[PDB]
Each structure stands twice: as structure tokens, then as C-alpha cells.
Amino acid sequence: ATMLKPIWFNRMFEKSTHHYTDSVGGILRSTGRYL
Amino acid sequence: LSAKNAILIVEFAKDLMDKEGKGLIEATLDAVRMRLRPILMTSLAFILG
Amino acid sequence: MPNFFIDRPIFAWVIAIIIMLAGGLAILKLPVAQYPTIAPPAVTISASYP
Amino acid sequence: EAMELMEQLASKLPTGVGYDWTGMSYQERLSGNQAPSLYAISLIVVFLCLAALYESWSIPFSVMLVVPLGVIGALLAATFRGLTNDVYFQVGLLTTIG
Amino acid sequence: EAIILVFLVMYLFLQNFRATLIPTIAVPVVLLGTFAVLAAFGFSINTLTMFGMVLAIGLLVDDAIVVVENVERVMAEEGLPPKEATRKSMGQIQGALVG
């Protein structure tokens, strides 16, 4: 709280987290037998 | 360690599942899957150590 | 109360130096060994008759 | 000052005759030089505690540099009477600075 | 090497000079304190304690990062001045850390 002040790999990280959410939703669509 | 990350995830989910009531499935996975930053950073640090 | 210490950084800083100094003093005096006392204590009696 | 002389005299004895210290001399040698380190660590702890009680880093100095004013009286009285630096005198200095 | 490498990876992730020294100054304090606690109980420093502690450094950096990154993420997302953002945030995460 004291020393912090507000004032190229980020796009790949955004792509990876979007893919992670997509895969999480896809596997959460059914679950069940995959479990 | 694995229990600690699991507890983090479930607590983060339940925090807005109960106190906010945002949703049950469609509204909790979206707000929880964005917490992959600390887990990945810590795993990377631990294996590299 | 970890909300009171936000506007009093000096208190946290000084307890940090206190624990650092205590740890350093403990380190300087503690002896370095190999293994703890992990063995069954035994008593040996020796007699000789040439 | 006499210890270095004593070891210098210990260095020029015939072979087969060594030296040793027993009694209070051994205790003095084993104790070592720890009084200045204890004084320094007490000084640091007092500074840290004062800075904890106050907030700014400069305010504790105003209290911290009051020691000699009280120390001067103890030495003046000791020289006037003809005292000696013993444990009672030391604890007197401690309570006066407190 | 562990303590320098954790700083390196955290700098790679956060990508800013600020908000990265907090765990690298928190870790040595915990290290010295654990040494002092072990000294208090009468145990000595030997191979077993060093191995257990080089095992535990992962959970120590975990405990540091789970707080610092949570604070950084919330203050970035909320678009609010840091004071009350961090206030709300540690108030919200204190119970989870205790549990």
C-alpha cells in the first residue's frame, strides 16, 4: 500500500486465457461420462 | 500445495456465489477462470527453483 | 487488525527489523551439525582377563 | 595492556615450558569482548522502539541525544567523592538514563 | 538461486519495477524468523531443517504472491485510487488467508 504507484507477451497470454475459458466451458457442457 | 490452490479456487467462486448471487454455473466459471495468473506463475517459479 | 497498519507503515517496518535482528542473532550463535540425536542410547561394559 | 607484555614474556622461555591461565584469568579470557556489542544492540533496540512509539524518523533523536546530560552528573559526583566503576555505579547510570 | 529466480519470473510476469520487491523482501524476513524459531526450541541447524525449508519456500512465496497479485489485479480492474482499493481487498481476502 505504500510504495506502489499507478503511474509484447500480453497478447499471447490473452489468447491463452481465452482458449482456457473456451475449453473449460466446453468440458463443462457435458461432464458426466468424462468424469 | 494442490489443496491450497483448490481452496483458493473454491473460495473465490463461493465468494460471489453466495454474497452476490451472480449465478450458479454460467456466471461463476467466467469469473473464476481468470485467476490462472497466480497459479501459473507460482508453478513456474516452483519447478524452475 | 490488518487495516490499522495501512496508515502506520513504520510499526510494520520496525517489527520487521526486530524479527530480522532476532533471526540474525540466532543464526550467528546456532551451531551447524549433521543429524539430530536419533539413536537408542546404550551403555557398554568392558572387562578384560589376559 | 599487561596481557601483551605477559605473552611477550611467555614467548622467550626455554623449550618444553608452556603457559596457561587459571581462575579468574581464564574466566576473563573466555568472556571475551561482548560489552560493546551488547551496548550497540541495546542502542539499536532503543532506537527501533522509540521510532515505533513516534512516527517520524527524526523525532526519536531529540530524546535519544539526552544521555550525556544525565551522565555528566554521575561522573561529576563520582570524581568528587572518589568512587570506582563498579556494578552499583553502572546500574545507577542505567536508572538515571531511564 | 531460488530467491533470485523468483524475482526474475515475477519481473517477467508483472513487467514493472514497482510491486515486485515485496515478496523478495518478505521472504528473507520469514527465513530469518524460522531460523530464530528453530533456535528457540533448542534444535540445531543441520541437513533435515535445510531440506524441509527449501521444500517450504514454495508455500512461502505462494503466501506472498496470493496477496500481492490479488491487490494488483483488483486495483487494475477497479480503476480506483490505491488506498481504498487495497483496503477493501485485504478486508476481503483476510478470511480466506485465515482459513
| Whole-angstrom distance, CA of residue E33 vs CA of residue C27 | 10
Residues 1-49 on B with a CB inside 8 Å of A are 25, 29-30, 33-34, 36
CA torsion, points D57, D59, D65, D69, in degrees to nearest 10?
-170
> CB contact, 8 Å: E48 with chain C?
yes
φ, ψ of residue E45 in degrees (nearest 5) = -85, 120
Give resolution, Å, one decimal. Answer: 2.9
| Whole-angstrom distance, CA of residue E99 vs CA of residue B10 | 12
Contact predicate A34/A27, CB 8 Å:
yes
Are the beta carbons of A6 and E82 separated by less than 8 Å?
Answer: yes
SS3 content of chain B, % helix, strand, coil (to 5): 75, 0, 25
Three-state SS letters, chain E = CHHHHHHHHHHHHHCCCCCCHHHHHHHHHHHHHHHHHHHHCCCCECHHHHHHHHHHHHHHHHHHHHHHHHHHHHHHHHCCCHHHHHHHHHHHHHHHHHC
Grid cell, residue E92, equals: 476481503
Q: Which is nearest to C13 in space by CA: D37, D49, E39, D58?
A: D49
For residues B12-42, b (16+ Cβ closer than 10 Å) or e, as one string? beebebeeeeeeeeeebbebbbebbbbeebb
Name residue, grid cell 489468447. A15
| Whole-angstrom distance, CA of residue E68 vs CA of residue E10 | 11
Residues forming a β-bridge with E45: C32
Method used for this model?
A: cryo-EM
φ, ψ of residue B11 in degrees (nearest 5) = -65, -45
Q: Which is nearest to B7 in space by CA: E86, D81, A13, E99?
A: E99
Q: What DSSP element (H or E) covers B12?
A: helix B2-18
Which residues in E lie closer than 8 A to residue C31 (C-beta atoms)? 44-45
Q: Which is nearest to E96 in space by CA: B38, A21, C15?
A: B38
Grid cell, residue C1, equals: 487488525
Grid cell, residue A18, equals: 481465452
Q: Which is nearest to D25 in space by CA: D54, D3, D50?
A: D3
Grid cell, residue E48, equals: 533435515
Contact predicate A15/B31, CB 8 Å:
no
| Whole-angstrom distance, CA of residue C26 vs CA of residue E37 | 9
> Is chain E adjacent to chain D, meaning 3+ CB pairs within 8 angstroms?
no
**Alpha-carbon distance A1 to nearest alpha carbon in chain E (angstroms):** 7
Rg (CA), chain D: 21
| Whole-angstrom distance, CA of residue D72 vs CA of residue E4 | 51
Residues forming a β-bridge with C32: E45
Are the beta carbons of E18 and A5 separated by less than 8 Å?
Answer: yes
φ, ψ of residue C32 in degrees (nearest 5) = -100, 125
Alpha helices, H only, D32-86: 35-53, 59-64, 67-81
Q: What DSSP element (H or E) covers C39?
A: none
| Whole-angstrom distance, CA of residue C15 vs CA of residue D49 | 9
User: Which residue on chain A is closest to E71 by alpha carbon?
Assistant: A1
Name residue, grid cell 485510487. E81
